[PDB]
Design a protein around this ligand. Structure first.
Ligand SMILES: CCCCCCCCCCCCCCCCCC(=O)OC[C@H](COP(=O)([O-])OCC(O)COP(=O)([O-])OC[C@@H](COC(=O)CCCCCCCCCCCCCCCCC)OC(=O)CCCCCCCCCCCCCCCCC)OC(=O)CCCCCCCCCCCCCCCCC
Ligand code: BCL
Ligand code: BCL
Ligand code: BCL
Ligand code: BCL
Ligand SMILES: CC[C@H]1c2cc3[nH]c4c(c3C)C(=O)[C@H](C(=O)OC)c4c3nc(cc4[nH]c(cc(n2)[C@@H]1C)c(C(C)=O)c4C)[C@@H](C)[C@@H]3CCC(=O)OC/C=C(\C)CCC[C@H](C)CCC[C@H](C)CCCC(C)C
Ligand SMILES: CC[C@H]1c2cc3[nH]c4c(c3C)C(=O)[C@H](C(=O)OC)c4c3nc(cc4[nH]c(cc(n2)[C@@H]1C)c(C(C)=O)c4C)[C@@H](C)[C@@H]3CCC(=O)OC/C=C(\C)CCC[C@H](C)CCC[C@H](C)CCCC(C)C
Ligand SMILES: COC(C)(C)C/C=C/C(C)=C/C=C/C(C)=C/C=C/C(C)=C/C=C\C=C(C)\C=C\C=C(/C)CC/C=C(\C)CCC=C(C)C
Ligand SMILES: CCCCCCCCCCCC[N+](C)(C)[O-]
Ligand SMILES: CCCCCCCCCCCC[N+](C)(C)[O-]
Ligand SMILES: CCCCCCCCCCCC[N+](C)(C)[O-]
Ligand SMILES: [Cl-]
Ligand SMILES: [Fe+3]
Lengths: 281, 240, 301
C-alpha cells in the first residue's frame, strides 16, 4: 500500500506529542496521536447521533436531526432528550476538527513542508465555532445555533436570514459573496490555464510558463504569475470564509433589525438627504 | 418527469466524471508496491489509465506516463518492525543520504529552459539588465545560520528571468566556495540574512553544483531537499 | 521559514514582450509600467495587451452597455450629481412589462432601453468568448479556457435569454441594478418555493464550496512546497520532483486518496465549471417545468 516513491519519506519522527508511540501508518493513512483522537471523537460522536435518532424515532437520514436546547434554556445544560445530546455532539465534533487539523501538522513535519494547509483549515473551524459557539454565547442561548440535520440545517439558514428581511443586504454578506464568486472564477482560470499549456494543440510541443503569462497579458493586459495566482487562491478563499464568519457574528448582536434599513445612513446623509427630486429619497 | 430525468442523468454523469478524474491521478506513483519493493496484491479498485505521451519542448525526448517507475537512487533505510505501515529508520546520515524531509528526486540533471531555449535561472550578474527593484538587497549581507553563528555572505542573487523573481541566494562560505540557498528558506533581515533550517556547520554540506552559471533540475532538488530536510534533522542547535 | 506569502526582494529586467508563435504582432500595445505594489504579490509588469478585431468590438459594445445603463441612472437622478451618488445603489433598468413580451415594440422609458443595453451585453460577452479562444489557438495552446468560460456564459444565457424566451416574455429576466438584482434573486426563490429544494441549486453550492475548499487547499500546498520550487507546475508534470512527491503523499497520508500534479488541476477545472453548469440547469427548469420545488420534493416528479 505504498506509492512508487513513498519509502524514503516514511521515516520516523516529527510527532507533535507521544513520541514514537503512534508513529505508524494504517494502509495509506497516517495515524499519529491525533488520528487516534480524531477516530475517538468521530466514533463516539456517531454513537450519539444514532442514539438521538433512537429517541426521536427514525433512522432514515433525511429525517434525523439534533436540535440544540430551547431558548428558555439559555447557555445552561439540557436533558439529552431535549437538546442535551446536541450539546455533547458539538464537543465531539469540535474534538474531531481540532484533532484533524493537529494531525495534519504532524504530517507536515514528516515531509518538511510548510504549515499552510492546516492554517488554511483553521479558517473553516473558526467559521463553525462562530455559528455554534461564538454567536450563541454572545446572544445568551444555545437555541440560536443551527441543528445537525441534512434538510433541517437549511431550514435554519432560511429562517435566520429572513428574520432580518432580505439577508442579501448584510454589508459583510455582500463582501463574503464577492470573494466566493471570485475564488471560483480564480480557480476556474488557473485550472484551465495550466492544462491548456501542458496539453497544447494536437501534436504540438508542451508549452511553457512563458506561454501562460503571454496568454493573460494578451487577454487582459496583466498576468499575476505562477507564485502569485496561488497566493490569490489562498487569499480569496480564506477571505470568503472570514466575512462569512464576520457577517454572522454581527447579525443579531450589534445589529438586529432589517438589514435593508442599515443602508439608510448613506441615503440620509445631511448634504443630499433633504434634496428631493430623486424618486428614491 | 423531466426534472427528475435531468437530476438522474446528471447524477450518472458525475459518477463517470469521478471515475475519469480518479484514474487520471494514477499516472505517477502507481503501481503500488509493498515495503519490500515488489508490486502489491490489491492496487486500489481503479484500473490504470491508457498511457498518455507528452511532447517535451526543445526536443528533450518524450515523457509517457504512466511509465516504468524506478527510484534510480539508492535509498538507505531499514525496517523498524515486522509489520507493514511502520516507519523506516535511516542507516546513515539522512541529510547526506537524502531520506525523509531531506529526500530528493532523480530528475534530469539538466536545467529548465524558458520558452525561448535559454536557462530559466541565471545568476543576476549574467542576467542582462536585471537588478533589485524594491525591498532589501540581500547581496552583501552575511548569511548567518540559526545557531546564531555566521557561515557566509550573499555574493549574488540567482534570479528567474521569465517570471522575474529571486529564487536563490548565492552564499559564499569561509573556505571561498559558494552554495545556493532556497529563497523561501531565508529571512532577509535589515543587517543579516537568517536561515531557519540549517546551523553553521551544515552550510558546507549543502550540495555543490557543477557549472557556476547554471543549476540543473536534479541539482536543485538535492539543494532544496538538503536545506528543507535540515528542519527536522538539524535541531543540533539554534533557538531564537 | 516565512510562510512565502509576500516577496522579501523584488527583481526586474527588461520588459517582457512575451512569446510569439503564430500570434500576430503589432497588435500588442507598448508595455505598460511596472507596479511595485503588485510585485509583492505577483508580477509587476502591466501589459502588453493584445487588441484585435473582436477586442475592439468587445470593449466598444461593453462601454455602450455600461453607458446605456448609466444614462438611465441620471434620468432618474433628475440629472443631479448629489442624488446620483446617494441613490446610486437603487436605480434600476427593468425589462418590458409582461403586457409586451418578446416583442421589441417596448417604449424606451418602459422597457425598450433594456433590450438596447441587452444587445450590447449579448454581443460584448460573445465577442470576448471569441477572444478567449483565438488567444489560445494563436499560441498553439489547449483551449480549456474557452470551454470553462462557456459554462459561465451558460448560467448567464439561461438567466437573461434562454429562460425569458421559454417563459414567453422578457418580463422575467434580470434588471440592471445593484440593490435590484438582489431583490430579484430573493423573489425568484420565493415564487418557486425555496430554491433550496431545487436539487441543482443544492448541487451548485456543493461545487461553489468545493471551489472554496479545493483552491484554499491547493494554494496552501504549492506555498507549503514552494521551498522545493513547486510553483513551477509544468516541469513537475514533465519531470516529477520532490515538491510533487511530498504533495501527493500529504494528500494520501491525510485522507487516503491520491493526486498528481496535472491531476489536481483536472479536479480544479471541473469543480468550478460544475457550479454554473448545474446552476443553469436548475434555473432553466425553474418555472418552465417545475413551478414549486417544494411540491416537487414531495413527489419527486
Ligand atoms: C443532464 C446531462 C448531463 C449534465 C450536463 C453535461 C455537460 C456536458 C459536458 C461535456 C464535456 C465533455 C468532456 C470532454 O470534452 O472531454 C475532454 C477530454 C479531453 O481533455 P484533455 O485531454 O485534458 O485536453 C487536451 C486536448 O488535447 C486539447 O484539446 P482542446 O483544448 O481542443 O480540448 C478541450 C477539451 C477539454 O475540456 C475540458 O476539460 C473542460 C470541460 C468543461 C466543459 C464545460 C462545457 C459547458 C457547456 C455548457 O474539451 C473538449 O474536448 C470540448 C468540450 C467543450 C464542450 C462545450 O477530457 C475530459 O475532460 C473527459 C471528461 C469525461 C467525462 C465523462 C463522464 C461521463 C460519461 C458518461 C457516463
Ligand atoms: C447568481 C445569482 C444572482 C446574483 C446574486 C448576487 C448576490 C447574492 C450578491 C451579488 C453581488 C454582486 N453581483 Mg450579482 N447575481 C447575479 C447576477 C449578476 C451579474 C450578471 C447580470 O451576470 C453580474 C455582473 C452581477 C454583479 C454583481 C456585483 C455587483 C457584486 C459582486 C460580484 C463579484 O464579486 O463578481 C466577481 C467579478 C469580477 C469581475 C471580479 N451579478 C444573479 C442574478 N450577486 C454581491 C454584492 O455585494 O452585491 C451588491 C451579492 O451580495
Ligand atoms: C434565505 C437564506 C438567506 C441567507 C442567510 C444566510 C445564513 C443563515 C448564513 C449565510 C451564510 C452564507 N451565505 Mg447567505 N443568505 C441568503 C443568500 C445568499 C446567496 C444568494 C444567492 O442570495 C448566497 C450565494 C449566499 C452565500 C453565503 C455565504 C457568504 C455564507 C456561506 C459560507 C460559509 O459561511 O462558510 C462557512 C464554512 C463552514 C461552516 C464550514 C465548516 C466545516 C467544518 C469545520 C468541518 C466539517 C467536516 C464534516 C464533519 C465532514 C463530514 C464528512 C467526512 C467524510 C467525515 N447567501 C438568503 C438571503 N447566509 C452563512 C455565514 O455567513 O456563515 C458565517 C450563514 O450562517
Ligand atoms: C455554510 C453555510 C451553512 C450551510 C448551508 C448549506 C446550504 C445552503 C447547502 C448546504 C449543503 C450541504 N451541507 Mg450545509 N451549511 C452549513 C454547515 C454545514 C456543516 C458543518 C459546519 O458541519 C456540514 C458538515 C454541512 C453539510 C452539508 C452537506 C449535507 C451538503 C453539501 C456540502 C458540500 O459538499 O460541501 C463542499 C465539500 C466538499 C465537496 C467535500 C466533501 C464533503 C462531503 C460531501 C460532506 C458530507 C457531509 C455529511 C452529510 C455529514 C456527515 C456527518 C457524519 C457525522 C460523518 N453543512 C452552514 C450552517 N449547506 C448543500 C446541500 O445540497 O444540502 C442538501 C446546500 O445547498
Ligand atoms: C433568498 C435567495 C435564495 C437564492 C436564490 C438564487 C437564485 C435566484 C440564483 C441563485 C444562484 C446561486 N446560488 Mg442561491 N439562493 C439562496 C441561497 C443560497 C446560499 C446560502 C443561503 O447559503 C448560497 C451559498 C447559494 C448559492 C448560490 C450559487 C451556488 C449560485 C450562483 C453561482 C454563481 O456564481 O453564479 C454567478 C455566475 C454568473 C452570474 C455567471 C456570469 C457570467 C457573465 C458572462 C459575466 C459577465 C460580466 C459582465 C460583462 C461585467 C464585466 C465587468 C468588468 C469587465 C470588470 N444560494 C436563497 C434560498 N440563488 C443561481 C443559481 O445557480 O440558480 C440555480 C441563481 O440564478
Ligand atoms: C476555509 C476555506 C474552505 C475549507 C478549507 C479546508 N477544508 C479542509 C482543509 C482545508 C484547507 C483540509 O485540509 C481538510 C481536509 O482533510 O481536506 C481533505 C478539510 C476538510 N474540509 C471538510 C469539509 C468541509 N469544508 C467546508 C468548507 C471549507 N473548507 C472552506 C470553505 C465545508 C462546507 C462549505 O460546508 C465542508 C463540509 C472535510 C472534508 C475536511 C475535514 C475533515 C474532518 O474534520 O474530519 C474529522 C471528522 C470526522 C472524521 C467526522 C466527525 C463527525 C462528528 C463527531 C459528528 C458531528 C456531525 C457534524 C459536525 C454535524 C452534522 C452535519 C450536518 C450539518 C449535515
Ligand atoms: C464557475 C465559473 C466562474 C467564471 C468563469 C470564467 N469567467 C471568465 C472566464 C472564466 C473561465 C474567462 O476566461 C473570462 C476572462 O476574461 O477572465 C479574465 C471571464 C470573465 N468573467 C467576468 C465576470 C464575472 N464572472 C463571474 C462568475 C464566474 N465566471 C464563475 C464563478 C461573475 C460573477 C457573477 O460573480 C462575474 C461578474 C469578466 C471579468 C470576464 C468576462 C468579461 C467580458 O466578457 O467582458 C466583455 C465586456 C467588457 C470588457 C466591457 C466592460 C465595460 C465596463 C468597463 C465594465
Ligand atoms: C457617470 O458615469 C457614467 C454614467 C458615464 C457611466 C456609469 C454607468 C453606470 C452607473 C453603470 C452601472 C451599471 C450597473 C449597476 C450594472 C449592473 C448589472 C447587473 C448587476 C447585472 C446582472 C445580471 C444580468 C443578466 C442576467 C443579464 C442577462 C442578459 C444577457 C447576458 C443578454 C441576453 C439578452 C437578450 C437575449 C435580449 C437581446 C437579444 C438580442 C438578439 C439583441
Ligand atoms: C478589461 C481589459 C481592460 C484593459 C486593461 C489593460 C491593462 C494594461 C494596459 C497596458 C497599457 C499600455 N499603454 C496603452 C498604456 O501603453
Ligand atoms: C491584489 C494584490 C494585492 C496587492 C499586494 C499588496 C502588497 C502590500 C504588502 C507588501 C508587504 C511588503 N513588506 C514591506 C511587508 O515586505
Ligand atoms: C465532484 C464531486 C465531489 C462533491 C460531491 C459531493 C456533494 C454532493 C451533494 C449532494 C446534494 C444532495 N442533493 C439532493 C441536494 O442533491
Ligand atoms: Cl484574512
Ligand atoms: Fe496549481
Amino acid at each position: 500500500a505504498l506509492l512508487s516513491f513513498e519509502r524514503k519519506y516514511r521515516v520516523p519522527g516529527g510527532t507533535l506529542v507521544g513520541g514514537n508511540l503512534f508513529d505508524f501508518w494504517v494502509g495509506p493513512f497516517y495515524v499519529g496521536f491525533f488520528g487516534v483522537a480524531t477516530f475517538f471523537f468521530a466514533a463516539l460522536g456517531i454513537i450519539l447521533i444514532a442514539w438521538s435518532a433512537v429517541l426521536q424515532g427514525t433512522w432514515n437520514p433525511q429525517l434525523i436531526s439534533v436540535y440544540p436546547p430551547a431558548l428558555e434554556y439559555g447557555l445552561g445544560g439540557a436533558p439529552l432528550a431535549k437538546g442535551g445530546l446536541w450539546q455533547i455532539i458539538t464537543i465531539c465534533a469540535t474534538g474531531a476538527f481540532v484533532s484533524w487539523a493537529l494531525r495534519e501538522v504532524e504530517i507536515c513535519r514528516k515531509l518538511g513542508i510548510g504549515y499552510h494547509i492546516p492554517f488554511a483549515f483553521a479558517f473553516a473551524i473558526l467559521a463553525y465555532l462562530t455559528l455554534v459557539l461564538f454567536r450563541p454565547v454572545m446572544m445568551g442561548a444555545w437555541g440560536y445555533a443551527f441543528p445537525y440535520g441534512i434538510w433541517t440545517h437549511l431550514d435554519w439558514v432560511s429562517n435566520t436570514g429572513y428574520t432580518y428581511g432580505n439577508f442579501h443586504y448584510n454589508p459583510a454578506h455582500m463582501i463574503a459573496i464577492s470573494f466566493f464568486f471570485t475564488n471560483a472564477l480564480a480557480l476556474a482560470l488557473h485550472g484551465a490555464l495550466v492544462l491548456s499549456a501542458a496539453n497544447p494543440e494536437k501534436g504540438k510541443e508542451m508549452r511553457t510558463p512563458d506561454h501562460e503569462d503571454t496568454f493573460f497579458r494578451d487577454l487582459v493586459g496583466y498576468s499575476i504569475g505562477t507564485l502569485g495566482i496561488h497566493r490569490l487562491g489562498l487569499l480569496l478563499s480564506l477571505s470568503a470564509v472570514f466575512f462569512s464568519a464576520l457577517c454572522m457574528i454581527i447579525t443579531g448582536t450589534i445589529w438586529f433589525d432589517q438589514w435593508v434599513d442599515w443602508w439608510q445612513w448613506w441615503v440620509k446623509l445631511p448634504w443630499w438627504a433633504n434634496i428631493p427630486g430623486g424618486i428614491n429619497g | 418527469d423531466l426534472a427528475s430525468l435531468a437530476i438522474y442523468s446528471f447524477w450518472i454523469f458525475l459518477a463517470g466524471l469521478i471515475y475519469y478524474l480518479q484514474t487520471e491521478n494514477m499516472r505517477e506513483g502507481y503501481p503500488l508496491e509493498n515495503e519490500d519493493g515488489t508490486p502489491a496484491a490489491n492496487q486500489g479498485p481503479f484500473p490504470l489509465p491508457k498511457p498518455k505521451t507528452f511532447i517535451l519542448p526543445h526536443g528533450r525526448g518524450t515523457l509517457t506516463v504512466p511509465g516504468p517507475e524506478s527510484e534510480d537512487r539508492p535509498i538507505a533505510l531499514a525496517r523498524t518492525a515486522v509489520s507493514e505501515g511502520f516507519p523506516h529508520a535511516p542507516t546513515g546520515d539522512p541529510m547526506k543520504d537524502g531520506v525523509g524531509p531531506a529526500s530528493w528526486v532523480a530528475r534530469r540533471d539538466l536545467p529548465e529552459l524558458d520558452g525561448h531555449g535559454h536557462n530559466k535561472i541565471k545568476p543576476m550578474k549574467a542576467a542582462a539588465g536585471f537588478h533589485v527593484s524594491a525591498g532589501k538587497n540581500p547581496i552583501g549581507l552575511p548569511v548567518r545560520g540559526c545557531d546564531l553563528e555566521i557561515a557566509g555572505k550573499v555574493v549574488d542573487i540567482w534570479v528567474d528571468i521569465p517570471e522575474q523573481m529571486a529564487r536563490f541566494l548565492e552564499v559564499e562560505l569561509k573556505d571561498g566556495s559558494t552554495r545556493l540557498l532556497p529563497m523561501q528558506m531565508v529571512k532577509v533581515q535589515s543587517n543579516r540574512v537568517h536561515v531557519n533550517a540549517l546551523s553553521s556547520d551544515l552550510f558546507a554540506g549543502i550540495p555543490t553544483i557543477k557549472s557556476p552559471t547554471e543549476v540543473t533540475l536534479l541539482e536543485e532538488d538535492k539543494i532544496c531537499g538538503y536545506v528543507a530536510g535540515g528542519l527536522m534533522y538539524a535541531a543540533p542547535k539554534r533557538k531564537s | 521559514e516565512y510562510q512565502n506569502i509576500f516577496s522579501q526582494v523584488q527583481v526586474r529586467g527588461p520588459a517582457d514582450l512575451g512569446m510569439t508563435e503564430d500570434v500576430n504582432l503589432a497588435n500588442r500595445s507598448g508595455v505598460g509600467p511596472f507596479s511595485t505594489l503588485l510585485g509583492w504579490f505577483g508580477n509587476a509588469q502591466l501589459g502588453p495587451i493584445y487588441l484585435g478585431s473582436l477586442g475592439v468590438l468587445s470593449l466598444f459594445s461593453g462601454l455602450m452597455w455600461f453607458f446605456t445603463i448609466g444614462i438611465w441612472f441620471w434620468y432618474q437622478a433628475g440629472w443631479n450629481p448629489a442624488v446620483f451618488l446617494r441613490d446610486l445603489f437603487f436605480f434600476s433598468l427593468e425589462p418590458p412589462a409582461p403586457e409586451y413580451g418578446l416583442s421589441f415594440a417596448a417604449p424606451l422609458k418602459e422597457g425598450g432601453l433594456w433590450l438596447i443595453a441587452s444587445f450590447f451585453m449579448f454581443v460584448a460577452v460573445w465577442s470576448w468568448w471569441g477572444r478567449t479562444y483565438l488567444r489560445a489557438q494563436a499560441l498553439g495552446m489547449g483551449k480549456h479556457t474557452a470551454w470553462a468560460f462557456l459554462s459561465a456564459i451558460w448560467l448567464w444565457m439561461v438567466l437573461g435569454f434562454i429562460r425569458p424566451i421559454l417563459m414567453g416574455s422578457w418580463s422575467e429576466a434580470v434588471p440592471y441594478g445593484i440593490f435590484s438584482h438582489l431583490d430579484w434573486t430573493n423573489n425568484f426563490s420565493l415564487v418557486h418555493g425555496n430554491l433550496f429544494y431545487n436539487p441543482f441549486h443544492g448541487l451548485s453550492i456543493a461545487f461553489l464550496x468545493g471551489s472554496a475548499l479545493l483552491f484554499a487547499m491547493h494554494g496552501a500546498t504549492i506555498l507549503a512546497v514552494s521551498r522545493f520550487g513547486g510553483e513551477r507546475e509544468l516541469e513537475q508534470i514533465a519531470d516529477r520532483g520532490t515538491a510533487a512527491e511530498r504533495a501527493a503523499l500529504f494528500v494520501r497520508w491525510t485522507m487516503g486518496f491520491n493526486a498528481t500534479m496535472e491531476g489536481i488541476h483536472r479536479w480544479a477545472i471541473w469543480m468550478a465549471v460544475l457550479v454554473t453548469l448545474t446552476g443553469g440547469i436548475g434555473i432553466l427548469l425553474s418555472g418552465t417545468v417545475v413551478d414549486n420545488w417544494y411540491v416537487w420534493g414531495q413527489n419527486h416528479g
